[PDB]
Write a protein that binds this ligand. Structure first.
Ligand SMILES: N[C@@H](CNS(=O)(=O)NCc1ccc(S(N)(=O)=O)cc1)Cc1cc(F)c(F)cc1F
Lengths: 724, 724
């Protein structure tokens, strides 16, 4: 028995998850069969919190649910309908937990864009027709905070396309204060932002294709504009258009185009904002306090902190979020050090200078939790391995007092940890993601004792002893004075004296990491397990978590180094023994599809065939926030030269050497079908034959059940034939 | 040496044409190297009419030219830009032939939609921004006849999309009177006609794809509306909004949706109109005279003629044009007889009845010319062969006096004749199109003597003796009580004892003819000549020129019989000895790609693989005027059942048996990319793998140089591999 295509497509061998939501410092919620329980971390006793059959007679399939922090109500999400990556619209109902009743009066309206409880109690903020509405009690009418909401144009409390995708990574553009006093929120004006237009074909029943219009700023176009507002939730008369206090931006930002690039409450009346210049090498953090007499908000110029880089852009993808101390007069934040690595800096609100509380030739991944005693963070420090993630705690009173809480718990099975903390960090869950099978455990902060095994994946482990699994080799090579890391999926019973066909798996994007220690069951699995193909990945220049030395290498020169290094990576895998060098392939999605595409066009004659899924083909076509962060503006004064020098269309000729499969979803809002339509065009003009495949009404995911299957099947056939 | 792909793609062996424009009863114009001459048919003397170098210093490449009937001016078309099938826009200049001067005053403006001389003299009618303009003299200002012209909405003197394509087959919707007194013209209101919208990608330079919007009535939608107008060209004050006399329609037509479906001047003041009901089984011809006292036009109810069919629709694609006698009180017209064949009927203006002046089991193709002595017509009567076209003359005073003027002139080389007549029919050109090489000859009507050989294609004939050409077998088979014709391109040295792979070439549309006697040098040529593949065609039910018995068979049941008969055809070619029955393919464009598609989806297991280019996939998606002419309205009262039963989507499942290559131009206005996007979708839902290929910014012709090459190359590889 082997790991076949269908094993992968039909999810034959499921990985197990343990999904819990902390509701207190010592309690969380689990979902079981169809039941919601609640486990106690201190005792281990659990009690049915809601019973599976409670909504057999609801009449609607329940997509998701939310429980008000004070446990008084449960929010029922249904009639879900996806939009973009994180955005969607739904109907909502509120069920009363104290009683046993579905609230009928003053319900949350159909087509609601976003919804959220206050961090405390059961206040509701909800965006609907682009406008904000508040409900202090589930059964009472709602206070319409905004009136300016207009479709495709004004966004109140929700992001527009570009902010959703490239900045915040959610639909929601609002933010409760810790006790739920204030509702901070952002506003987006798409007024002069140009529309991307594309057909949507719908059911065969639909006689005329719908044209879809989306405010989308391509590289160097008119951006959306943003204002920020804070509202008081308490002072709300049922006969008063409620008063929203606009916090304006710093004037160092108001000189040109800017983006609001972070929002973090510090205390009950202190809120921190972070602003980014359109040229994204210079950032600023305001700290804004409440003038109780005025009702205004005051951002002291003395409390501002500047973040900037000389070597490139600011942040990994944006400037990091801050982690404030209970009182809120000092904060911790991840920044590049002088050597260019990403470590934690301790800041005093009024002191421009900070002090680095971690150091080394590694990078802090993220600050996970902060107490009066400790700061919890993830880094790749253990064994100088960047593919690995571990939980550490550092003594706030003694910065030389660092203990790894996860390194030693299972060195062979576990090297990729994520963490979930209880309120105020009494307990933590550790999720291990590889290189062995996923391992989920509970832990108490107090003494760092391993309470229990929540999931071991024994169930799966049993099935996998029956199946001929491939192995995963993670190593490095040395190119210049640097080690660059790579990973390989080796077919089961890998004989290093034979010659194998190799498929270079490509992403290669600024701050990518395709070489890590995670356990995966994907298509690559199948390709090694069954077709005895080596699927390799490699993190060349531009990849992240290895200091700005490597990451910023790609700066202002996209589609150059990261592309060259992937070709180089092939060369070196051939210098090892096991690679048939007349059957080397390359594939990629999105950025990786672009890189896959630049490679096939490089003339390097290293690769027989490649597949490009939803590739970017020319940077000018991609959105501004992402493109410019890397390439600045496409104008002869700024960077137009490297824009025009980095296209796939320019390399159209060299595809005469290779066999190319090009695949794009026609309803892709993210990388537009445009990009592939320009590619297919170029090739045709210079007479290169190739393979194409469009996916009707698919997006950037090609993620619908049928399509996902179809595309992956189709690509197999292609690689099979290409390799014979 | 063989006929390779490149031979075809790079036009290696050119067929020769002889293109002449009659300017008188005895003189025509020829174009040579770069010169315009004029030949005299009577003497044979020719004189340079315009010299090649006359416009070396013009500064613009001249796309086309027109010479005023009175030889006084030449119209120079340049900055040509194609729109749809017949429509385009251009700049114009007028060069004075009497003098030697390019007119500078009051020029014809850039972006002109259409332009035409009066049949006599040198009046100009020209449509520009949808409005009509007249110039009686090239140098004087122009009288703006219409003011109602609005883009995409009101069409003055030009057709909109659906009329252009499906009705008239030109851009122009105006009509001079014989001496150039009147300018009859049509008007089109697209006001509630729905828009087809589709992207256009342009040069890679273009950052946001252009959306293209076109008033296109899909089957059963809101149609454009039409009004008709006649103007007097003489009474034109340079300070008078000129008066256009609206001729309204008959009231048997005004009860519902109608189309103007023909316009033919009878005399200097008698004009004939033909109106068609939206349900296209009932037509009417008005005959409208000029009330000199009134300045109005009068369509006597006593002069109306009704044309209708019980077995289906009226006409081959529309009701025929009439041919009036010099005085204009009687006309000749081609209609179905009682047996259902298309012959000539002699009509008196006031008598409802006509008399058939031809009869038999064959069809009159068209009335070519009419004198006071004779009527010239083309028919397929010779040898009971429908694939063949011949020129006959019938004695107007004696209907039993018919002589074929072309049958016997070269029986072996020539069976497909077209004709070009001089003014009042003193001389005629015969174009022979096959089965041998094209042969162009000059003839005098008077005695029917063959004056000279204008082109013999000897030049080509020489090259083709060096090359291994395939042969062409035209035969029939008997299916029911009927003979259905087929044709076959046999590889060179065709050994009927061997087993050959066969490609069924498919069109199959209502009134199609793929089986004829014409000499072609296309892709099929290469496929037989080089890949020893038999390329067959077959004219099953629904095909034309074989009476309404066969043509109307397909009525109201599209995607049924014509599809079935093609499968049948295969069966029969296998019952002959020469066909490998494990390597039978099928291909088709437009209608033929739909039929290719319905077949591969029929489950008949006869065909290994097929290619569908720009196929219709569901009839509701195609335009009204074509679809309904065959299928009526798509409503449960009328025909919705056969609409829904005839889709390619419905046969998605069976494609599992075959290998399918689906090809569509993204910028196709005619058969929308929609149609293939619905097809590719269906297949993906039921899990059928297939092959796809889109062509960025190509139209329904995929006719751009590069693309034409690319597609035909791509299709070769597919057939090659499919046949091994
Ligand atoms: N839209 C871009 C950003 N996608 S993303 O929202 O997913 N940002 C990357 C990212 C990865 C990981 C994390 S983290 N470490 O917080 O989980 C944040 C952001 C990715 C992208 C790049 C392309 F080149 C492209 F063609 C399309 C595309 F979506």
């Amino acid at each position: 028995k082997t790991y076949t295509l269908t094993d992968y497509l039909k999810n034959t061998y499921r990985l197990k998850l343990y999904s819990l939501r902390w509701i207190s410092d010592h309690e969380y919620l689990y979902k079981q069969e169809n039941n919601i329980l609640v486990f106690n971390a201190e005792y281990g006793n659990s009690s049915v919190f809601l019973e599976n059959s409670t909504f057999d007679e609801f009449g609607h399939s329940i997509n998701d649910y939310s429980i008000s922090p004070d446990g008084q109500f449960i929010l029922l999400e249904y009639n879900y309908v996806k939009q973009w990556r994180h955005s969607y619209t739904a109907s909502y109902d509120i069920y009363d937990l104290n009683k046993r009743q579905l609230i009928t009066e003053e319900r949350i309206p159909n087509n609601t864009q976003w919804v959220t409880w206050s961090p405390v109690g059961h206040k509701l903020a909800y965006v609907w027709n682009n406008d904000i509405y508040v409900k202090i009690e589930p059964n009472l009418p709602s206070y319409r905070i905004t009136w300016t909401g207009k479709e495709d144009i004004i966004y109140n409390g929700i992001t527009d396309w570009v902010y959703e995708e490239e900045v915040f990574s959610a639909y929601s553009a609002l933010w409760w204060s810790p006790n739920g006093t204030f509702l901070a929120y952002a506003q987006f004006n798409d007024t002069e932002v140009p529309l991307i237009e594309y057909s949507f074909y719908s059911d065969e029943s639909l006689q005329y294709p719908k044209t879809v219009r989306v405010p989308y700023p391509k590289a160097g176009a008119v951006n959306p504009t943003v204002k920020f507002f804070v509202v008081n939730t308490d002072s709300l008369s049922s006969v008063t258009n409620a008063t929203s206090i606009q916090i304006t931006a710093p004037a160092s930002m108001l000189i040109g185009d800017h983006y609001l690039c972070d929002v973090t409450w510090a205390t009950q009346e202190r809120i921190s904002l972070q602003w980014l210049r359109r040229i994204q090498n210079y950032s600023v953090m305001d700290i804004c306090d409440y003038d109780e007499s005025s009702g205004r908000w005051n951002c002291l110029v003395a409390r501002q902190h500047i973040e900037m880089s000389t070597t490139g852009w600011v942040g990994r993808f944006r400037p990091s979020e801050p982690h404030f101390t209970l009182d809120g007069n000092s904060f911790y934040k991840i920044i590049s050090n002088e050597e260019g690595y990403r470590h934690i800096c301790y800041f005093q609100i009024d002191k421009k200078d900070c002090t680095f509380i971690t150091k080394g030739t590694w990078e802090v991944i993220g600050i996970e939790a902060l107490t009066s005693d400790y700061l919890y963070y993830i880094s790749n420090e253990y064994k100088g391995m960047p593919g690995g993630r571990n939980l550490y705690k550092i003594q706030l009173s003694d910065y030389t007092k660092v203990t790894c809480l996860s390194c030693e718990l299972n060195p062979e099975r576990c090297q990729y940890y994520s963490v979930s903390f209880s309120k105020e960090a009494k307990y933590y869950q550790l999720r291990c993601s590889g290189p062995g099978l996923p391992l989920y455990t509970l832990h108490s902060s107090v003494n760092d004792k391993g309470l229990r095994v929540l999931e071991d994946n024994s169930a799966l482990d049993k099935m996998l002893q029956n199946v001929q699994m491939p192995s995963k080799k993670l190593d490095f090579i040395i190119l210049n004075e640097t080690k660059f890391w790579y990973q390989m999926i080796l077919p089961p019973h890998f004989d290093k004296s034979k010659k194998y066909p190799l498929l270079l798996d490509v992403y290669a994007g600024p701050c990518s990491q395709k070489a890590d220690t995670v356990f995966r069951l994907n298509w690559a699995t199948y390709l090694a397990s069954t077709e005895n193909i080596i699927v390799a990945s490699f993190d060349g220049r531009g990849s992240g978590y290895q200091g700005d030395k490597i990451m910023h290498a790609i700066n202002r020169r996209l589609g150059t180094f990261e592309v060259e290094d992937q070709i180089e990576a092939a060369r070196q895998f051939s210098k090892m023994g096991f690679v048939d060098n007349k059957r080397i392939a390359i594939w990629g999605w999105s950025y990786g599809g672009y890189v896959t595409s630049m490679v096939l066009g490089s003339g390097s004659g290293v690769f027989k065939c490649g597949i490009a899924v939803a590739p970017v083909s020319r940077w000018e076509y991609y959105d501004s926030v992402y493109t410019e962060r890397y390439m600045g503006l496409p104008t002869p004064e700024d960077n137009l030269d490297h824009y025009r020098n980095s296209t796939v269309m320019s390399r159209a000729e060299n595809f005469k050497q290779v066999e190319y499969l090009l695949i794009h979803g026609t309803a892709d809002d993210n990388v537009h079908f445009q990009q592939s339509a320009q590619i297919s065009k170029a090739l045709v003009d210079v007479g290169v034959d190739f393979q194409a495949m469009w996916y009707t009404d698919e997006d950037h995911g090609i993620a619908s059940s049928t399509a996902h299957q179809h595309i992956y099947t189709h690509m197999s056939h292609f690689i099979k034939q290409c390799f014979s």
